[PDB]
Write a protein that binds this ligand. Structure first.
Ligand SMILES: Nc1ncnc2c1ncn2[C@@H]1O[C@H](COP(=O)(O)OP(=O)(O)O)[C@@H](O)[C@H]1O
Ligand SMILES: Nc1ncnc2c1ncn2[C@@H]1O[C@H](COP(=O)(O)OP(=O)(O)O)[C@@H](O)[C@H]1O
Ligand SMILES: Nc1ncnc2c1ncn2[C@@H]1O[C@H](COP(=O)(O)OP(=O)(O)O)[C@@H](O)[C@H]1O
Ligand SMILES: [Mg+2]
Ligand SMILES: [Mg+2]
Ligand SMILES: [Mg+2]
Lengths: 372, 372, 372
């Protein structure tokens, strides 16, 4: 009778909802905003901190901080604030009568999940909770069993291969290059056209510009030549103070960092080579099914050229006798939450919860014994 | 009214069917596979063991083990699993109403036969059972009564001479050099070209390469010279992951171990010398008939150069006035099963079964006093 | 009158010197570094590539590549750079008047040895060159004739048994698991404590951490329990930028892959099982002498728990009436070079060189008819 709660706490967004639903009920940015100026009007119910959409609406007088950086919770008081807001203000629910399912990026510090379990059991004390890997939930949402999931969000980009329900943990690859780094690089290269964005609110503006006008090119050199030749790739964006900026090759130079990380001085390979190397680390007999089941999840995969570019690159890397399919569902921005709702509604999962009694007996160390 | 069952349990393959048929109904690999990677998805009916074609089709996440090694059952739980699979899932029969005929290589340990009888009477209890030697079944299938049978399979290569229905057990020669050793030698010599196959799953790939591309050279030195001079003996093979590997002299070096065991460090003589030595241990009055009635059986005799090579070698060893003939029927891979089905259907064999009453009276030791 | 050169090119280090000596003259890492950032100061003697110690010293602005992977030369221009550095800059010698001895792991591709011969005779033209197996040299340096050598370096781990100077190639075992794999595994498992090492410059830092702080436990479960109980096994390491990290069970979990390869997803057996399997594949009359003469060589055998652990494991596997003795000399990091210098100084070896006239007459294939 007691329904469960699925809460995906990503680096940039929080997606919370109820188990068994098709879409998350609450989606809001994971920011805590604090006033930086002097208050002069007495009364009027001024608060010392702001969370979520309230921080975004008043961001012109606030400094915004992200409690999660690269999938790791850096500030715990702010994260506790975010959880309090998502339980009592958005979902409008009492945490002490609902089991909770949370998510974790692969190859993360163990202290992160230990303190997550401790806060959930000692501050928002729940009957049960479960910490799950995001790529497995994305595969649950896709409805299939074999596939290699590339999950790219705001802090982390990771590839995880799964075959017939079994993971190959030695082939999991993690890259700390995601949407926030793309926002930073776009911010840096906008200074070539005279536009100066420095503050935290201007970072939100640049992120909005990236979400609106950026795309992944099929061929980088040809698009550069086209942008140099004619003014056909230039788009105009209107700022909140009515100013209009015009961007050209920066529309496709920003997500190209996903394929050329050396644009921001990193030594790693692109996401295509990382995926290919993750497939080559697996057994030979499962590579054929891995090539045809590339599943893309997360908001950083929403650029409207990324599937074709990925297919072209992996086809250039893979043998010519192989069929390569890139799976990009239209609702892949919410794939982790949809998979968590699918998993938490299964009758075969109800014995895999971490109960309050087990936590009391074992302490904040059972999260490694019961969760993979 | 009760139909008899014929099950040939070799080192590599299980050939099971009903007596009176022309071909075995169920031929499947004799392996048990178990998961080695980490299962991350719940439900979906995951099993803790896979047997037969289900293990081979899913081998990329499994470790594969052969219960039978060199014709001796090493693991008995897995052997019971194989027998259960071949009685229920493949043959779709209830063993409580069908006598069973089984096969055993010459010069085997007694305990193997004893435990086979005990399992067949106490786990899959049968009205009666029998254990037969493979070479007499091969000579039954060949249709003749006199001849020398060279049976080479996956674990054992044995020569048995028979004259007018009487065997000479002192001339029986057993050699533990068969198909698995050839697969291992091919795996070793494929590293000369940079190809690495290490795991148990890749052993099956190398086995397929051996079954498809290898052959026996009529003269080994001239074949080596031909391979060194021109690239006319090279063949390409496409791997499961789409890689293409080219092999040259390894096509005829791998089965050359049958004629030169010293390639794998074995001091024994070749198969031709073993056949000649078995013939020369017999009486002088039967060697003329044994020379002209050489019968081959098993899957190791399926290389497309072995009959001519054996004829040439034995003609080199034998007197020039004798006629040497090699009998290589196209169905010789299934010769043991065909001979068993012919034998189990005879009206004079129904008195030679080991019934349940006699097993209760004598225990698992009547298999020596009733089976030769 | 011409002094012979002894050069050992492993996967990680180059040990070069003159025959007849006791220690190699030049021991330097086998890496080539190339700049990855933008040069802004004109002139100043900037080079396009760096080799050896100079590449390691300037690694903060360089990308470092290993020309040899798993004992196989993957890049040949970098290999020519390494050999030019070790001939003209380190040894300070002219190659045209010194014969050269090179080493190679067992079960390598033939093309590697052929191209080594071709490069040594056509680019660094030597009067003579000879390629030898590393384990035979280790037995030469050990002073004895009978023994089984376990040589583990940076790319390969191979077992070679020798009895009275005769080798048994069918019992030679090779495992592609060595120091670099342990470095990668340590990089993976240091992420549990929040440390992120990604770039190739940080791989050397992790290698230094492994060389200074890692060790092999005598009992794995007991040491895991001890680490879980108290913080007595924890050690601190200072990073190049002054940061201090602390590691606990990661000290002994990293080399345990040599005994449990499944930690990195490999299906193979541990080094103790591989040594026991190599002993069991030999003749029965030499196993007693192989048991008492386990010879350890290579830098991966330098952990301060590995001899006792190997003795315990082999004594567990071997019959109780056998004397198992592990021979781990203090200078076993340079056993290959010492054996090569011993062999190249023998008067009975001077007729086994491959002169330039023989190479001209036969081509780059006499290295198979002359070298074992
Ligand atoms: N349509 C889009 N095009 C490009 N980038 C997008 C788009 N939508 C979202 N993003 C990026 O995705 C990131 C967040 O995606 P998501 O995975 O849903 O959140 P989280 O990373 O917190 O899980 C943001 O940094 C944003 O810049
Ligand atoms: N066409 C072929 N060429 C060469 N070898 C073959 C061929 N077909 C099967 N084999 C080998 O025969 C062996 C098994 O043959 P068979 O005697 O029928 O089974 P078992 O040895 O279990 O009795 C396998 O090891 C396989 O490698
Ligand atoms: N004290 C040590 N303890 C453990 N490992 C070591 C130690 N010193 C060196 N190594 C390892 O030995 C490897 C190379 O050893 P060596 O065999 O001398 O070189 P190569 O493998 O190139 O022949 C390196 O990868 C290094 O990690
Ligand atoms: Mg996410
Ligand atoms: Mg057989
Ligand atoms: Mg070495």
């Amino acid at each position: 009778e007691t329904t469960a709660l699925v809460c995906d706490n990503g680096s940039g967004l929080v997606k919370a909802g109820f188990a068994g639903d098709d879409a998350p009920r609450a989606v809001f940015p994971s920011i805590v905003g604090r006033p930086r100026h002097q208050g002069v009007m007495v009364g009027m119910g001024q608060k010392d901190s702001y969370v979520g959409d309230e921080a975004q609406s008043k961001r012109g007088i606030l400094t915004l901080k992200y409690p999660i950086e690269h999938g790791i919770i850096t500030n715990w008081d702010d994260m506790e604030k975010i959880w309090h807001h998502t339980f009592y203000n958005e979902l409008r629910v009492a945490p002490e009568e609902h089991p909770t399912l949370l998510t974790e990026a692969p190859l993360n510090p163990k202290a992160n999940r230990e303190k997550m379990t401790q806060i959930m059991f000692e501050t928002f004390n729940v009957p049960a909770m479960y910490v799950a890997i995001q790529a497995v939930l994305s595969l649950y949402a896709s409805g299939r069993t074999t596939g290699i999931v590339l999950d790219s969000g705001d802090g982390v980009t990771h590839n995880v291969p799964i075959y017939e329900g079994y993971a190959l943990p030695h082939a999991i690859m993690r890259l700390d290059l995601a949407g926030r780094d793309l926002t930073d690089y776009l911010m840096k290269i906008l200074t070539e056209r005279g536009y100066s964005f420095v503050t935290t609110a201007e970072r939100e503006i640049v992120r909005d510009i990236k979400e609106k006008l950026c795309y992944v090119a099929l061929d980088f050199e040809n698009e550069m030549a086209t942008a140099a030749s004619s003014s056909s790739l230039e788009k105009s964006y209107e700022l909140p103070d009515g100013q209009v900026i015009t961007i050209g090759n920066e529309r496709f130079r920003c997500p190209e960092t996903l394929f050329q990380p050396s644009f921001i001085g990193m030594e790693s390979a692109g996401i295509h080579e990382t995926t290919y190397n993750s497939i080559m680390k697996c057994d030979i007999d499962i590579r054929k099914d891995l090539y045809a089941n590339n599943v893309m999840s997360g908001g950083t995969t929403m650029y409207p050229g990324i599937a074709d570019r990925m297919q072209k690159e992996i086809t250039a890397l893979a043998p010519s006798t192989m069929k390569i399919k890139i799976i990009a569902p239209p609702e892949r921005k919410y794939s982790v939450w949809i998979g968590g709702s699918i998993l938490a509604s299964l009758s075969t999962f109800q014995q895999m919860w971490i109960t309050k009694q087990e936590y009391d007996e074992a302490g904040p160390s059972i999260v490694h014994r019961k969760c993979f």
